[PDB]
Ligand binder design. Structure first.
Ligand SMILES: COc1ccc(NC(=O)CN)cc1
Length: 284
């Protein structure tokens, strides 16, 4: 069923809450035993959001390999993503260790550091060129090289140095700066524009490690980004939007991380973004 007609059918019947609960009911349930170990309690932002054991990212250290991060591997689309929580004060060094070890070229941030007067994530990157950050626990140095500010998003060029070997790499930071907490973007237009910028950078391409994507919990806004990208890519591979079932793609992604898409409104927005984005893929 053309999703654009499935969309109008759900809208006119006001059944978004009903579709969403059906997904919640059919979603995979896998063990998260490492996340729940007592030694890891201060590595988790939210007690109810944990990576599955089978798909969790392992840190390359003997001490404690744990981070709240999952590998989402989309076999037909040939895209991979790492979805992770907003870093905590004690996990900013783990965060940059993961980017280094996984060979990522992009970090995608969909939240502000403050929303609702609570810190949704640590200030984990430098704000001024001349004030670099050193992560003593993981032996990394991070420097701001350049910043480009637009109205609702900013891009940054960062330099990450492995202080152990003195190798350096260029990391691109894509910061979507106007997406409300457990909300939806102002318009499919600004979201998709932002998406088409990450895609142009090379950050999603198979020559690099997987893109790191986060919000506060790494499931809601983060879920919407990878779901829209994969659905549009599938359209591209088969040049046939008719063939894509957004609900089936979401359940496939939920085999690798729990809770992706946190509200019925986030599900409705995901449909809107894919429908409007398709008007580019099919040749306009
Ligand atoms: C901060 O703004 C910039 C972002 C990226 C670059 N370099 C690239 O290679 C992007 N494809 C340069 C400046």
């Amino acid at each position: 069923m053309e999703m654009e007609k499935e969309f109008e059918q759900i809208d006119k019947s006001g059944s978004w809450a009903a579709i969403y609960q059906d997904i919640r009911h059919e979603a995979s349930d896998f063990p998260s035993r490492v996340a729940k170990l007592p030694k890891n309690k201060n590595r988790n932002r939210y007690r109810d959001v944990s990576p599955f054991d089978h798909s969790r990212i392992k840190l390359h250290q003997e001490d404690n390999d744990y981070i709240n991060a999952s590998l989402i591997k989309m076999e037909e689309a040939q895209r991979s993503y790492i979805l992770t929580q907003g870093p905590l004060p004690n996990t900013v060094g783990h965060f940059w260790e993961m980017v280094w070890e996984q060979k990522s070229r992009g970090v995608v941030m969909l939240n502000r550091v403050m929303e609702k007067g609570s810190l949704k994530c640590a200030q984990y990157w430098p704000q001024k060129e001349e004030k670099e950050m050193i992560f003593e626990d993981t032996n990394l140095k991070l420097t701001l090289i350049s910043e480009d500010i637009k109205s609702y998003y900013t891009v940054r060029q960062l330099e990450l140095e492995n202080l152990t070997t003195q190798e350096t790499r260029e990391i691109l930071h894509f910061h979507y700066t106007t997406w409300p907490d457990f909300g939806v973007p102002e318009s499919p237009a600004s979201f998709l524009n932002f998406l088409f910028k990450v895609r142009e950078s090379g950050s999603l391409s198979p020559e690099h490690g997987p893109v790191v994507v986060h919000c506060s919990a790494g499931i809601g806004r983060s879920g919407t980004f990878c779901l829209a990208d994969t659905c549009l890519l599938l359209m591209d591979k088969r040049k046939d939007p008719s063939s894509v079932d957004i609900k089936k793609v979401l359940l496939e992604m939920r085999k690798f991380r729990m809770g992706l898409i946190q509200t019925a409104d986030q599900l409705r927005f995901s449909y809107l973004a894919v429908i409007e984005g398709a008007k580019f893929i099919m040749g306009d």
